[PDB]
């Protein structure tokens, strides 16, 4: 399918795209995970990794992406689901 590899927000390293996440910020300023890159809005991309989930909090990351005040509860839920991700991976469930 020969699919674009993106640049990680946090690192700044091409991304795996077993590893692909993408988060979107939409016009309304809310900002969500989008599990199936098909959402509308302005998207930024991380991979599917703690340190990189946790760097994303450390960093504010997406609050300079997308000219805005990200709330902390977002990334605390980036933190979580990204923790869950890799635990199910590690483990074989997907």
Do not use: C, W
């Amino acid at each position: 399918r020969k699919i674009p590899l993106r640049k990680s927000v946090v690192s700044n390293e091409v991304i795996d795209k077993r590893d692909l996440l993408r988060i979107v910020k939409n016009k309304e300023g809310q900002v969500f995970i989008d599990p199936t890159g098909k959402a509308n809005g302005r998207g930024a991309y991380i991979k599917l990794d703690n340190a990189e989930a946790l760097e994303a909090k450390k960093k504010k990351v997406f609050n300079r992406s997308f000219s805005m005040e990200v709330e902390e509860s977002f990334y605390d839920e980036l933190i979580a689901y990204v923790d869950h991700k890799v635990k199910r991976r590690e483990l074989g469930l997907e």
